[PDB]
Design a protein around this motif. Structure first.
Motif, mmCIF file in Angstrom:
data_model
loop_
_atom_site.group_PDB
_atom_site.id
_atom_site.type_symbol
_atom_site.label_atom_id
_atom_site.label_comp_id
_atom_site.label_asym_id
_atom_site.label_seq_id
_atom_site.Cartn_x
_atom_site.Cartn_y
_atom_site.Cartn_z
ATOM 1 N N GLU A 1 0.824 -1.204 0.000
ATOM 2 C CA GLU A 1 0.000 0.000 0.000
ATOM 3 C C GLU A 1 0.861 1.257 0.000
ATOM 4 N N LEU B 1 4.698 6.739 -6.120
ATOM 5 C CA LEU B 1 4.443 6.983 -7.538
ATOM 6 C C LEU B 1 3.379 8.055 -7.732
ATOM 7 N N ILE C 1 3.973 11.640 -9.640
ATOM 8 C CA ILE C 1 3.164 12.117 -10.762
ATOM 9 C C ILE C 1 2.581 13.491 -10.450
ATOM 10 N N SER D 1 3.354 17.027 -12.443
ATOM 11 C CA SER D 1 2.298 17.875 -12.989
ATOM 12 C C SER D 1 2.367 19.285 -12.413
ATOM 13 C CB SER D 1 0.930 17.249 -12.718
#
Lengths: 226, 191, 183
Positions: free
Chosen positions: A207, A213, A217, A221
């Motif tokens: 978990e 990750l 991400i 962004s």
């Protein structure tokens, strides 16, 4: 009228709308309360029990009527409306045990029931109720032979997550350690406990893996937007 | 729309939620179906696959994935024992993290199949086959089916371990290697 | 030779064999010193294997005594390696419930803190993205730049003869002087 269902339908719309302001009948209310038990639709019974006046005498009568009935969910809902946290937890545990014994509840349905039970436990001296629920789950997992092992592991992981989000909780974790004392009461096999602990640790690591990750991400962004 | 905007609403909750991560996996599958081969995304595509108990969702990816990184149907030949296996590196999912995550679970039995698809790891394939998969006969066969005579680091690294199970085959292989008999071989899958 | 063989093995780049010989010779202090003096680095994988082997040799070797204290000392000396999860498989059968519970509580607290930090970072990133999008949307069609009574720059002659390449902070260009500058 020589038809009970006609009387039920007549009394349905009579009290369905709360717009009534000048009410004087008393026998009709008791007749409606008593004859609502004749309705065989459990889902419709739960829907009706979701919204009701729920007088104290009416609540006691409904609980007495549902004592013979197998609708444990309705009893738990009534207890929640009656602010009986311990009774609601016991009813939820009994319903979960009945579903496990029947072996018909779906995996998604079992997960939803576990989430509802965790929410009810968090709603509530909740440490004692949580310890009792954990002990009951451990006993059910031990009694049930291995199919439901994955469900038991998922329930244990959910309970651990709820305990973590409660604050471990310090002394509550010690209460979990006190629950470990109840484990001494269980005195189960060492291999099973070690396997369960290893599975819990592996699930926690898996978990936590995806969070990195997701954060990467999101950071990429945000940097591009900036 | 932008991908991270879609991904943002997911996550957060890590409850078992088969529906939520099933939808996430479907979205990633559709994203990787046509284009946009982000290196991180496919890595995540593996992680969620490990999160679920599905197996056929992984091998099918290996079946229709090009060595150079093209998702297309039809298994074809690859530049084995070439730059793609010795010099070219390209980009793909991080093998080390993925291998560790797979070894965390019990699904490592098929991981040996996944090792072949991933490039490099010349000295890691033997370790995976010997230590994890056991079956020293298979490890000996793989060592026989190893690359050209330049592939001697594995022998110098694991000869002590190899000579414990079947010394006779190990002794024959060592004699052949040290006697100049460095010819290659085909590859397939008490005295 | 207890020490000469160890030194020769260390000089021979055979650290696994040297560690095994030291463990067989009950030279815990020498093995610990060698492990801590691991100048050579192999991504800590070989170091992790050596630490696991040393822990296994130490574990189930003598009486537990101060089992919790010994485990804590071993973990501290491990220097952020060989977590309690790795030692759990080799724990065998015992009654050290308190130490395991404390370690599990610490791990759960660390995981909860990490999850809270990740959630806070995600929320901050979302807020920053929303603010950036709002600023970008506001900046559109809000230029409202003004030209002074008579204007010119760089070229010197006159702004209003060729074009109106205008920048913020009051600058003027002819679309030709600027392309001359970059050349």
């Amino acid at each position: 009228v020589k038809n009970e269902e006609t009387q039920q339908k007549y009394l349905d719309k009579l009290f369905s709308t709360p717009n009534i302001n000048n009410k004087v009948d008393k026998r009709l209310r008791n007749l409606h309360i008593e004859l609502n038990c004749k309705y065989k639709s459990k889902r419709e019974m739960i829907l009706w029990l979701n919204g009701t006046v729920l007088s104290n005498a009416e609540s006691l009568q409904i609980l007495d009527l549902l004592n013979q009935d197998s609708n444990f969910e309705a009893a738990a809902i009534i207890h929640e409306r009656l602010e009986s946290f311990n009774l609601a937890v016991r009813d939820l545990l009994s319903f979960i045990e009945q579903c496990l014994n029947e072996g018909k509840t779906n995996i998604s349905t079992l997960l939803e029931s576990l989430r509802r039970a965790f929410d009810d436990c968090n709603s509530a001296e909740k440490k004692s109720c949580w310890i009792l629920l954990i002990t009951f789950l451990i006993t059910l997992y031990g009694k049930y032979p291995s199919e439901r092992k994955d469900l038991c592991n998922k329930l244990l992981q959910e309970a651990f997550l709820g305990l973590v989000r409660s604050k471990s909780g310090g002394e509550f974790w010690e209460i979990m350690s006190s629950v470990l004392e109840h484990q001494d009461v269980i005195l189960m096999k060492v291999q099973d406990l070690k396997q369960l602990l290893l599975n819990v640790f592996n699930t926690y690591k898996l978990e936590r893996s995806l969070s990195e990750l997701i954060q990467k991400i999101i950071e990429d962004s945000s940097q591009d937007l900036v | 729309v932008e991908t991270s905007e879609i991904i943002s609403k997911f996550g957060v909750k890590e409850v078992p939620d088969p529906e939520s991560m099933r939808n996430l996996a479907d979205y990633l599958w559709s994203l990787i179906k046509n284009s946009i081969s982000q290196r991180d995304h496919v890595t995540l595509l593996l992680i969620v696959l490990i999160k679920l108990k599905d197996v056929e969702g992984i091998d099918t990816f290996i079946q229709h994935f090009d060595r150079k990184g093209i998702w297309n149907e039809g298994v074809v030949m690859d530049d084995m024992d070439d730059v793609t296996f010795f010099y070219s590196d390209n980009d793909f999912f991080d093998l080390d993290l993925i291998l560790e995550l797979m070894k965390e679970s019990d699904f490592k039995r098929l991981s040996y199949r996944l090792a072949k698809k991933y490039s490099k790891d010349s000295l890691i394939i033997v370790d995976i086959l010997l230590n994890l998969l056991h079956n020293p006969v298979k490890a000996i066969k793989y060592i026989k089916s190893l690359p050209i005579d330049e592939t001697l680091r594995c022998l110098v690294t694991y000869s002590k371990k190899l000579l414990e199970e079947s010394p006779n085959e190990t002794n024959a292989l060592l004699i052949e290697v040290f006697t100049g008999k460095f010819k290659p071989s085909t590859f397939e899958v008490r005295t | 030779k207890t020490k000469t063989s160890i030194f020769l093995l260390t000089r021979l780049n055979l650290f696994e064999d040297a560690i095994d010989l030291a463990l067989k010779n009950n030279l815990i202090d020498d093995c610990k010193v060698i492990v801590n003096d691991e100048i050579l680095i192999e991504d800590y994988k070989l170091r992790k294997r050596l630490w696991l082997k040393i822990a296994k040799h130490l574990l189930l070797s003598m009486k537990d005594i101060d089992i919790k204290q010994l485990i804590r000392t071993i973990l501290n000396d491990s220097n952020e390696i060989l977590t309690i999860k790795d030692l759990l498989p080799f724990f065998n059968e015992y009654t050290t419930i308190a130490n395991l519970k404390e370690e599990l509580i610490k791990f759960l607290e660390n995981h909860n803190m990490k999850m809270n930090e990740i959630s806070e970072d995600i929320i901050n990133s979302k807020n920053l993205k929303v603010e950036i999008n709002t600023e970008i949307s506001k900046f559109n069609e809000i230029y409202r730049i003004l030209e002074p009574g008579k204007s010119c720059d760089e070229c010197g002659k006159f702004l209003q003869i060729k074009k109106f390449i205008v920048f913020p902070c009051g600058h003027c260009f002819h679309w030709n002087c600027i392309i001359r500058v970059i050349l």
